[PDB]
């Protein structure tokens, strides 16, 4: 009674989210207006930008948002395919619980279906070897030509290949770190000037008297006090004159040189500026003195840059002056401020020693939206190439994996025994919504299209899918649309994980 | 609103009280759960504890619960019995009013019914042998009466300690005692069946420095509440002074005054000393080397309570300290707290009979609550024993025999007080009926079987087997109640019913 | 009052019972963005808002003696609720509550006697102990998703607990919550581990580890009677706040140096400027410590416990021979090499997730517990549904012999206890009625060792499968469910302020 | 729940079980009639208002069992009602109906086998068998409303059956009825007796009569004379039969004399002149009789059908040993002493009301039946709940023994059987639950003769008390109730038009 009712309600909420998102799938896509508290409009063809700003009440909606976020952070694209698989599996679950079979068997059967489906997708895919630049560029162009970012991904794809080659030798199958390869902007500019920056791009400096460039830069990681503390007020006594506060002013003028002499025995060249809530103070009257004898201040550093610079140049994190020893110092090859193709004060660090070969790409553009679209293009390019390199053997897309996987999973349910057999059959014959969604968004009769795909996968080619850029079922064109095999692996595994978790969930309780 | 219908509404309120006390009397009674606005939950069988916070629903119930509460010291176990008996009185009183009798006439019928009940009840049972000296049948009484209800297992020790404590104080006031001198100190933290007799007062015991072994050599106690120990206003502090030399000099002056009151302490001979405050630990170790038990965190009121107990007068000031005025305590002892981590002070003199309290261990809040309830019930029932030692043969047997006698004497009354006599007899009949209904036995069947057993066999001691043991003779089970407890039970019930009846309006 | 609450709490706990159960999601009120999914019914009972006083007193009566033994909660609560529901049916059939109480007391006595008779001793043999400990760890570590990681927990916990051989070290065992590498492997500390950084400002391999055991640490400073010369007199001199800090540091650090100890352990994080102060002064203050670390130092090297440390002799010269640090996970973690394993231990898991580590540490706590008493004890009983259904069969057998009206209450007790393996099967999706009836037949015709194999949903001869449950936890859950059901049942009416 | 009416229509019958039963009223439909009370459910179900077709089917099974058993139609209906109650309870437990049918059939097989193996054959004895016949007949008749003169009727019935010597004959007893008088005025006597008034005209002083059946009297103006045959004509054949019939007056004597006569018996009216002619001939003809008893006349006297004397010689003579007519207080009743079959006896109960009369003859039919199938096949079982408890114990043992879902179904069937003596005790006002628990314990420890003493509520070894019931009725009640509950259960929904 109550457990069945609450599971039905959870399934209904998840299916409502999924079917509201179903229309916006794939490169073709169709948008909605978001039901929000401000009343604005959205023309966002994608699916992620709905869940990421969805007013969610039911915990099923929240868990589907976590599903989409996990899929995006894992591999990027497919963020709508995952949620639509989830919704279809929950619809199959609605049917199965309508017949009354128990949720735990549903979870176990879906786990078996997941394992066999991963085996199937690994089987039929093309075992492309990713070891050299020609293979990398082939994978990159196959990944970029199938999306709408092709126009500008062309110039940046070889550079992203260079970056991922810097990170590791592709013979090492370990995944590259998406966060390690940071993306930065230099304000304005052209498009071609977006260039690789080995080392790191750093924030803008203040240039009272500090040098613009230095060979063999001795970068120091500074987080400690600057002055005699102006602890609580600008004046401690009658405000006729600063009779006693002159002491702390000249103590600033003395402690600045005291710390600079404490630095020069180590040789800190640059200064990352932490905010004034951590620092005692920051002002030109002391920053000039630090600058003139080779301590350049760089504005408003943040924790991500601190972690990145620690990972790169080996400077240990610092919270006090006494650790000014060489542990907080790094010795690069060269550090320069470069302003080509439009002036820009962002500092660069070059050729420093690093355990991990962190690399960044600077992004340029005549408009801010162009810069950010280039950033998201390079972001998804790194996502797809990383999920390929860590798993190899990319797969053709366009519902072809769903058709082939549903067919072999239906026959697997045929040969499988026990209660789980019909569960796996329902999983397979409901999972086919993705090609049905492509057919709906392509204008073809969805059911007839799904039947045609299933028939063509039978007794014939298994890579045949629905073509989104020419039209309809196609087999002759191999490059219909291709995604790394990890895209489908993550989709199926996260979808089944969340579905079987939903099945495991019972009797929602307020604290 | 007015008149007999208003009295019927009062009767309904009394039934609301009585039907919920119905399931609670007897050892097998169904406990209630007490919840305060704080949300704390505790289970209890004691009718007095249930009524302690039972909130009013209609006013006369509040009046009657206050009336029942006012006799807790004398009524003992069976206060819920009082309530259910009075509720039965009112329930049958409603039938009498349906028959059209004016309330005051059933009221005075009930008071003469109580009179004949008392007259028969004085003749209902025999007297136990002597209380003060032998005490062994009294041990048997205390076992078969108190340890049967809710304690984990009945065993001799709590009863023996209680009877020893009372007999130390029972005989001076012409075989009487007042519970002002005997109290309970509940302190969870030890093994449940571990409890000690205390012919004194319990205080939380601290040594300012535990480096010296647990020991006691009391010959007299220095009851001090003066700056002899450097006073503190109960505030956390860590002192600093202008110079270390100044601190050294302050320490020297501290020890000089400590030595001069050592001369003051040793001229009277109070080898033990106590105070609210205490100095720092290292100097306290040095202080203990000077043979004075420096203490800290002593209970505020407890200091003057023990000072008045020990025959001394507390010393708030230096100028008020005199050698003769200190407390001539007899002995002090280190009672183990069950756990090996700490021990408490007990201050006691065996010569003087006063202030013989009970010091008990416990593992849980409600368990120590039922423990103190059971020991208080023991204390009051043994007061009823010492006041006069003849028993009542309780456990429904007294009620059934008394109701039989009242029914027999009913027809001897020429007026409708005869009907009141029948009503009182039925109300007394209800008590064995209650003891069966809350238990797993058919009420009326076994109740009337006990009635017939008393009618055909010439012994009124035959009652209801509340403990569900095979034997039905209440003497054979030896489960018993004091006659005085029953005297108060019947008298309080009849006074309660008559007070309810005399009230008529709003 | 009627027992709607006492069965409602049991019903909301039922689906979580045992492995292959059903999960629960707990979310905060006010529609704020916070929720969590959990399988352990103890977590639900901890997070439940008990609006029913009967449910509140039931969960309270459980908590005093259910989380102690470990994993009993999901069994004791459900068994008590089923008992209350069956007794509600009985009182609907006009069976008086006290009859039910007496019948259940005698039935629980019979069931405990049957459990003791069916319990099998496994002392005096090392290999039997090994297999029993791995089996009981697998049954108690029945919570993680990854089966190879399940085995990792089993082996790690077993090898951590067995190396005692003596009286309990559960007071000294710990499971460090530090995040490591893969979420599928586990580890144990050859010397208990701290999250404290080592090397940048303090020696690496600390020979003659003094290990002063302090509680009153420096949040900012401390004090000693010296005659301070404070420069910040009032609001007129707020700029002189730093003047007294150096004195308040030195007037303790210097005397601790004269005490002979640089290894100052305390819970409180000594700050960055105090990090300069302590490092320059030559004292290696460890800014994280606990009761558990001090007592492990005591048990392993003959030390002791201290408190309110101001006096040097109030703390021990914890002369640990040497201390190092190890490289597990993404931190530089001090590793007390001197306190070797065998007397006590601390487990650490690798994995970069707090929330997974939460259920991990809960399962290892319940395991480490049951492991501890069952090593202290010597007996175990066949787990799954075998033991409880055996006790139910014994209750049914002695119930038939009972003349009194409490025979019906005894049969009700037997049915309620029989319902527990029924719930085990139901949460696993198998045919509950068929499984429980065929189990009743399978070990009612003798064959006392027969049990329900939940791994495939078939009758299983539990003697060779090895799925066993420690005797102490079964006896404790039986007695606790009995007493809680008595407490809930024996109250008929409730009043509130 | 669709068949709850089938439970209800047996529920209105459980209030009548046991000799210590409890009556209801049949309220006559509509107006112009009066109510009447009724103890036994046989009259309750007979002409009962039925609203549910499944209840109708249960009623039809009750009538069929009453037809083929006689007594005990209450027990079958109440047992079927309890079975259907427990069946609905099991369906709520999601146990499929067909499993219930299979388990119930297995349980009935085992229970019938145990009952047969446990019933006692009083066997080859005479004086002990006499006492057994006496008390079993007395207790079986005590199941009816009558309490005073049960023993006399039972002793007379067993005397008749001993005259049968095993040849069970429901028609050996001649059953005449007579309104008025008291129940103590009831009389049996040997031979075949007629309740008419014959006096002297056909003398009561005759020997070795030729008993015949002849359905044509002298008032019939029957045509078969020596004269003309039957014709339909008025030209010359108006009333020649009136002249012919004068030959019959002498033929009715002379034809039988030529065949050979000492007396004659005729069951129809005879005209006066043949009346004195037979008086001078020595013939004892009766004016009227219960013509349904013509088979009784043929049996007890050895008489045969005479074909209304259309063919005078195709018949053989009857016989007796005396002819008599006696004034029994108020009726001058005819007495054929010792007709050819010595087992002939005639029973009359002087009932002031016809309902006591009708129930008394129903009880007499039941008595002769049970004496037949407990004399030729001597078998009896201890009643008073002993048999039901014994078969419930057997079924419970089977349920514990048997695997599969059938175990719960047959355990519920056993408890439904247990409900029958529970209902008996409840109607008796005793502590029904405690009493049946005590009896169940007595059988579990082992007492195949333990039951309930109905005169005063307590368990007792029923052999000493002498209380019992016949085996055949109990076995048939069990089997018929089981199959009726089965046929009700095997239907899920009813289709109406």
Swiss-Prot record, chain A:
Key words, A-Z: Acetylation, ATP-binding, Cell projection, Chaperone, Cytoplasm, Cytoskeleton, Hydrolase, Methylation, Nucleotide-binding, Phosphoprotein
EC number: 3.6.1.-
Domain of life: Eukaryota
Disulphides: none
Positions annotated to bind ATP: 26, 78-79, 147
GO cellular component: cell body; cell projection; centrosome; chaperonin-containing T-complex; cytosol; extracellular exosome; melanosome; microtubule
GO BP annotations, alphabetical order: binding of sperm to zona pellucida; chaperone mediated protein folding independent of cofactor; chaperone-mediated protein folding; positive regulation of protein localization to Cajal body; positive regulation of telomerase RNA localization to Cajal body; positive regulation of telomere maintenance via telomerase; protein folding; protein stabilization
Residues annotated for ADP binding in this entry: 26, 78-81, 145-147, 398, 483
N6-acetyllysine PTM sites in chain numbering: 261, 275, 292, 299
Family of this protein: Belongs to the TCP-1 chaperonin family.
Subunit-structure text: Component of the chaperonin-containing T-complex (TRiC), a hexadecamer composed of two identical back-to-back stacked rings enclosing a protein folding chamber. Each ring is made up of eight different subunits: TCP1/CCT1, CCT2, CCT3, CCT4, CCT5, CCT6A/CCT6, CCT7, CCT8. Interacts with PACRG. Interacts with DNAAF4. Interacts with DLEC1.
Function: Component of the chaperonin-containing T-complex (TRiC), a molecular chaperone complex that assists the folding of actin, tubulin and other proteins upon ATP hydrolysis. The TRiC complex mediates the folding of WRAP53/TCAB1, thereby regulating telomere maintenance. As part of the TRiC complex may play a role in the assembly of BBSome, a complex involved in ciliogenesis regulating transports vesicles to the cilia.
Alphabetical list of NCBIfam families matching this protein: chap_CCT_delta, thermosome_alpha, thermosome_beta
Name assigned to this protein: T-complex protein 1 subunit delta
Species name: Homo sapiens (Human)
Curated annotation (Swiss-Prot), chain B:
One Gene Ontology biological process: positive regulation of telomere maintenance via telomerase
InterPro entries: Chap_CCT_epsi, Chaperone_TCP-1, Chaperonin_TCP-1_CS, Cpn60/GroEL/TCP-1, GroEL-like_apical_dom_sf, GROEL-like_equatorial_sf, TCP-1-like_intermed_sf, TCP-1_chaperonin
Residues that, per the record, bind ADP: 26, 78-80, 148, 395, 465, 481, 486
Annotated effect of mutating residue 149 to R: Found in a patient with severe developmental delay, intellectual disability, pyramidal and cerebellar signs, visual impairment, polymicrogyria and pontocerebellar hypoplasia; uncertain significance; the orthologous yeast mutation induces yeast lethality suggesting loss of function
Positions contributing to Mg(2+) binding: 77
Induction, per UniProt: Down-regulated in response to enterovirus 71 (EV71) infection (at protein level).
Keywords linked to the UniProt accession: Acetylation, ATP-binding, Chaperone, Cytoplasm, Cytoskeleton, Disease variant, Hydrolase, Isopeptide bond, Neuropathy, Nucleotide-binding, Phosphoprotein, Ubl conjugation
Binding site for ATP: 26, 79-80, 395
PTM sites of type Phosphoserine: 319
Catalysed reactions, semicolon-separated: ATP + H2O = ADP + phosphate + H(+)
Molecular-function GO term, any one: beta-tubulin binding
Listed EC numbers: 3.6.1.-
Top enzyme class: hydrolase
Subcellular location: Cytoplasm; Cytoplasm, Cytoskeleton, Microtubule organizing center, Centrosome
GO terms for cellular component: cell body; centrosome; chaperonin-containing T-complex; cytosol; extracellular exosome; microtubule
UniProt cross-references to PROSITE patterns, sorted A to Z: TCP1_1 (PS00750), TCP1_2 (PS00751), TCP1_3 (PS00995)
Cross-link (Glycyl lysine isopeptide (Lys-Gly) (interchain with G-Cter in SUMO2)), chain numbering: 183, 187, 238, 248, 252, 365
Alphabetized Pfam families for the sequence: Cpn60_TCP1
PTM comment: Ubiquitinated by the DCX(DCAF12) complex specifically recognizes the diglutamate (Glu-Glu) at the C-terminus, leading to its degradation.
Assigned protein family: Belongs to the TCP-1 chaperonin family.
Xref: NCBIfam families: chap_CCT_epsi, thermosome_alpha, thermosome_beta
PANTHER family: CHAPERONIN
Protein name, UniProt field: T-complex protein 1 subunit epsilon
Gene: CCT5
UniProtKB/Swiss-Prot annotation, chains C, D:
Residue ranges of the TM segments: none
Residues noted as binding ATP in the record, renumbered to the chain: 18, 72-74, 469, 474
PTM sites of type Phosphothreonine: 235
A Gene Ontology term for the protein's cellular component: extracellular exosome
Catalytic reactions of this protein: ATP + H2O = ADP + phosphate + H(+)
PANTHER family, per the entry: CHAPERONIN
Protein name (record): T-complex protein 1 subunit beta
CDD domains (alphabetical): TCP1_beta
Modified positions (N6-acetyllysine) in chain numbering: 128, 155
Similarity comment text for this entry: Belongs to the TCP-1 chaperonin family.
EC number(s) per entry: 3.6.1.-
Glycyl lysine isopeptide (Lys-Gly) (interchain with G-Cter in SUMO2) cross-link, chain position(s): 222
Entries under SUPFAM superfamilies matching the protein: GroEL apical domain-like (SSF52029), GroEL equatorial domain-like (SSF48592), GroEL-intermediate domain like (SSF54849)
One GO term (biological process): scaRNA localization to Cajal body
GO MF, one example: ATP-dependent protein folding chaperone
Class in the EC hierarchy, top level: hydrolase
Modified residues (Phosphoserine): 34, 234
Residues annotated to bind ADP: 18, 72-75, 142-143, 384, 469, 474
Top-level division of the source organism's lineage: Eukaryota
Keyword terms, alphabetized: Acetylation, ATP-binding, Chaperone, Cytoplasm, Hydrolase, Isopeptide bond, Nucleotide-binding, Phosphoprotein, Ubl conjugation
Residue positions binding Mg(2+): 71
Functional note: Component of the chaperonin-containing T-complex (TRiC), a molecular chaperone complex that assists the folding of actin, tubulin and other proteins upon ATP hydrolysis. The TRiC complex mediates the folding of WRAP53/TCAB1, thereby regulating telomere maintenance. As part of the TRiC complex may play a role in the assembly of BBSome, a complex involved in ciliogenesis regulating transports vesicles to the cilia.
Gene (UniProt): CCT2
Subunit (UniProt): Component of the chaperonin-containing T-complex (TRiC), a hexadecamer composed of two identical back-to-back stacked rings enclosing a protein folding chamber. Each ring is made up of eight different subunits: TCP1/CCT1, CCT2, CCT3, CCT4, CCT5, CCT6A/CCT6, CCT7, CCT8. Interacts with PACRG. Interacts with FLCN. Interacts with DLEC1. Interacts with SVEP1.
Cell compartment(s), UniProt: Cytoplasm
Naturally occurring in which organism (per UniProt): Homo sapiens (Human)
């Amino acid at each position: 009674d109550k457990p069945a009712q609450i599971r039905f309600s959870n399934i209904s909420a998840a299916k409502a989210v999924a079917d509201a998102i179903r229309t916006s799938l794939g490169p073709k896509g169709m948008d909605k207006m978001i039901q929000d508290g401000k009343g604005d409009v959205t023309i966002t063809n994608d699916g992620a930008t709905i869940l990421k700003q969805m007013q969610v009440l039911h915990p099923a909606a929240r868990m589907l948002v976590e599903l989409s976020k996990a899929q995006d952070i894992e591999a990027g694209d497919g963020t709508t395919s995952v949620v639509i698989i989830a919704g279809s599996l929950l619809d199959s679950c609605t049917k199965l619980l309508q017949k009354g079979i128990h949720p735990t068997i549903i979870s176990e059967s879906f786990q078996k279906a997941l394992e066999k489906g991963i085996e199937i997708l690994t089987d039929m895919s093309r075992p492309v070897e990713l070891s050299d630049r020609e293979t990398l560029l082939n994978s990159a162009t196959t990944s970029l030509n199938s999306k709408v970012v092709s126009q500008y991904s062309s110039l940046l794809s070889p550079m992203s290949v260079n970056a991922v080659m810097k990170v590791i030798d592709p013979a090492t199958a370990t995944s590259v770190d998406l966060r390690d390869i940071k993306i930065v902007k230099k304000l304005g500019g052209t498009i071609d000037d977006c260039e690789l920056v080995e080392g790191l791009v750093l924030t803008q400096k203040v240039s009272n008297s500090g040098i613009t460039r230095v060979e063999k830069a001795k970068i120091g990681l500074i987080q400690f006090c600057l002055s005699a503390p102006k602890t609580d007020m600008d004046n401690q006594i009658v405000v006729s004159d600063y009779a006693q506060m002159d002491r702390v002013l000249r103590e600033e003028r003395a402690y600045i040189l005291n710390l600079v002499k404490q630095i020069k025995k180590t040789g800190c060249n640059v200064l990352l500026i932490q905010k004034s809530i951590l620092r005692d103070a920051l002002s030109d009257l002391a920053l000039h003195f630090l600058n003139k004898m080779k301590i350049m201040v760089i504005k408003d550093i943040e924790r991500e840059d601190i972690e990145f610079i620690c990972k790169t140049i080996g400077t240990k994190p610092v919270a006090h002056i006494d650790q000014f020893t060489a542990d907080m110092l790094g010795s690069a090859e060269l550090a320069e401020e470069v302003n080509l193709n439009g002036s820009g004060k962002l500092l660069k660090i070059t050729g420093c020693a690093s355990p991990g070969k962190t690399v960044t790409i600077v992004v340029r553009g005549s408009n801010k939206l162009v810069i950010e679209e280039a950033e998201r293009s390079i972001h998804d390019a790194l996502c797809v190439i990383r999920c390929l390199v860590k798993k190899r053997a990319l797969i053709a897309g366009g519902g072809a994996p769903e058709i082939e996987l549903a067919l072999r999973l239906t026959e697997y349910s045929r040969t499988l025994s026990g209660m789980e057999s019909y569960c796996v059959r329902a999983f397979a014959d409901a999972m086919e919504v993705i090609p049905s969604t492509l057919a709906e968004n392509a204008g073809l009769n969805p059911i007839s299209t799904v039947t045609e795909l299933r028939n063509r996968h039978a007794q014939g080619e298994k890579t045949a899918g629905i073509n989104v850029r020419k039209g309809g079922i196609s087999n002759i064109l191999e490059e219909l649309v291709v995604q790394p095999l990890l895209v489908s692996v993550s989709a199926l595994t996260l979808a089944t994980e969340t579905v079987r978790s939903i099945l495991k969930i019972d009797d929602v309780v307020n604290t | 609103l007015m008149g007999l219908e208003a009295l019927k509404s009062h009767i309904m309120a009394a039934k609301a009280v009585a039907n919920t006390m119905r399931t609670s009397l007897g050892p097998n009674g169904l406990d209630k759960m007490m919840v305060d606005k704080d949300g704390d939950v505790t289970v209890t069988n004691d009718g007095a504890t249930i009524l302690s916070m039972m909130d009013v629903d209609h006013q006369i119930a509040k009046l009657m619960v206050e009336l029942s509460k006012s006799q807790d010291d004398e009524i003992g176990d069976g206060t819920t019995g009082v309530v259910v008996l009075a509720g039965a009185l009112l329930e049958e009183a409603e039938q009498l009013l349906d028959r059209g009798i004016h309330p005051i006439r059933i009221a005075d019928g009930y008071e003469q019914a109580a009179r004949v009940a008392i007259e028969h009840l004085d003749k209902i049972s025999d007297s136990v042998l002597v209380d003060i000296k032998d005490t062994e049948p009294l041990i048997q009484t205390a076992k078969t009466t108190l340890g049967s209800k809710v304690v984990n297992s009945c065993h001799r020790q709590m009863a023996e300690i209680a009877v020893n404590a009372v007999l130390t104080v029972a005989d001076m006031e012409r075989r009487d005692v007042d519970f002002e001198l005997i109290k309970v100190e509940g302190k969870v933290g030890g093994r449940l069946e571990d409890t000690k007799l205390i012919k004194g007062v319990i205080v939380d015991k601290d040594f300012s420095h535990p480096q010296m072994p647990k020991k006691v050599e009391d010959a007299k106690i220095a009851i001090l509440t003066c700056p002899f120990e450097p006073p503190k206003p109960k505030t956390k502090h860590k002192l600093d002074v202008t110079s270390v030399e100044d601190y050294k000099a302050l320490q020297k002056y501290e020890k000089e005054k400590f030595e001069e009151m050592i001369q003051q302490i040793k001229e009277t001979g109070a080898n033990l000393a106590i105070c609210q405050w205490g100095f720092d630990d290292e100097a306290n170790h040095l202080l203990l080397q000077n043979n004075l038990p420096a203490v800290r965190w002593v209970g505020g009121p407890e200091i003057e309570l023990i000072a008045i107990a020990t025959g001394g007068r507390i010393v708030p000031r230096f100028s008020e300290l005199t050698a003769e005025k200190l407390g001539f305590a007899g002995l002090v002892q280190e009672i183990s707290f069950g756990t090996t981590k700490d021990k408490m002070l007990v201050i006691e003199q065996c010569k003087n009979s006063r202030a013989v309290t009970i010091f008990i261990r416990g593992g849980n809040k409600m368990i120590i609550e039922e423990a103190k309830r059971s020991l208080h019930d023991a204390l009051c029932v043994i007061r009823n024993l010492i006041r006069d030692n003849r028993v009542v043969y309780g456990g429904g047997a007294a009620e059934i025999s008394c109701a039989l006698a009242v029914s027999q004497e009913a027809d001897k009354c020429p007026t409708l007080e005869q009907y009141a006599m029948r009503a009182f007899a039925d109300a007394l009949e209800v008590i064995p009926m209650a003891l069966s209904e809350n238990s797993g036995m058919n009420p009326i069947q076994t109740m009337t079987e006990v009635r017939a057993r008393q009618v055909k066999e010439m012994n009124p001691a035959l009652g209801i087997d509340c403990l569900h043991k095979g034997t039905n003779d209440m003497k054979q089970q030896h489960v018993i109640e004091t006659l005085i407890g029953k005297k108060q039970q019947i008298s309080l019930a009849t006074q309660m019913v008559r007070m309810i009846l005399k009230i008529d309006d709003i | 009052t009627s027992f709607i609450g006492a069965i409602a709490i049991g019903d909301l706990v039922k689906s979580t019972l045992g492995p292959k159960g059903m999960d629960k999601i707990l979310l905060s009120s006010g529609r704020d963005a916070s929720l969590m999914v959990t399988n352990d019914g103890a977590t639900i009972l901890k997070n439940i808002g008990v609006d029913n006083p009967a449910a509140k007193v039931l969960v309270d009566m459980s908590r005093v003696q259910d989380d102690e033994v470990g994993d009993g909660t999901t069994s004791v609560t459900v068994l008590a609720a089923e008992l209350l529901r069956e007794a509600e049916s009985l009182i609907a059939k006009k069976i008086h509550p006290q009859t039910i109480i007496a019948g259940w007391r005698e039935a629980t006595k019979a069931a405990r006697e049957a459990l003791l008779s069916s319990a099998v001793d496994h002392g005096s043999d090392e290999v039997k102990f090994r297999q029993d400990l791995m089996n009981i760890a697998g049954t108690t570590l029945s919570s993680k998703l990854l089966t190879h990681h399940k085995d990792h927990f089993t082996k790690l916990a077993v090898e951590a607990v067995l190396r005692l051989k003596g009286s309990g070290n559960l007071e000294a065992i710990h499971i460090i919550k530090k995040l490591g590498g893969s979420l599928a492997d586990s580890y144990l500390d050859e010397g208990f581990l701290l999250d404290k950084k080592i090397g940048v400002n303090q020696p690496k391999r600390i020979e003659n580890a003094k290990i002063l055991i302090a509680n009153t640490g420096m949040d900012t400073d401390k004090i000693k009677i010296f005659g301070s010369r404070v420069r910040v007199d009032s609001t007129a001199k707020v700029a002189e706040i730093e003047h007294a800090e150096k004195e308040k540091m030195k007037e303790k650090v210097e005397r601790i140096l004269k005490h002979g100890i640089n290894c100052f352990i305390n819970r409180q994080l000594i700050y960055n400027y105090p990090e300069q102060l302590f490092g320059a002064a030559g004292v290696m203050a460890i800014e994280h410590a606990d009761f558990a670390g001090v007592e492990r130092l005591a048990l392993v090297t003959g030390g002791e416990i201290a408190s309110t440390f101001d006096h040097p002799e109030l703390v021990k010269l914890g002369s640990c021979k040497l201390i190092e640090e190890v490289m597990i996970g993404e931190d530089k973690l001090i590793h007390f090499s001197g306190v070797a394993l065998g007397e006590a231990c601390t487990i650490v898991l690798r994995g970069a997730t707090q929330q997974i580590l939460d259920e991990a540490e809960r399962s290892l706590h319940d395991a480490l517990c049951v492991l501890a008493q069952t090593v202290k004890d010597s007996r175990t009983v066949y787990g799954g549904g075998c033991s409880e259904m055996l006790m139910a069969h014994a209750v049914t057998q002695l119930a038939n012999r009972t003349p009194g009206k409490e025979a019906v209450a005894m049969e009700s007790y037997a049915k309620a206890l029989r319902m527990l393996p029924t719930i085990i099967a139901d949460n696993a999706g198998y045919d509950s009625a068929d499984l429980v009836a065929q189990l009743r037949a399978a070990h009612s015709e003798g064959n006392t060792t027969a049990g329900l194999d939940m791994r495939e949903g078939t009758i299983g001869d539990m003697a060779i499968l090895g799925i066993t449950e420690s005797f102490q936890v079964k006896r404790q859950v039986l007695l606790s469910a009995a007493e809680a059901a008595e407490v809930i049942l024996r109250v008929d009416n409730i009043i509130k302020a």
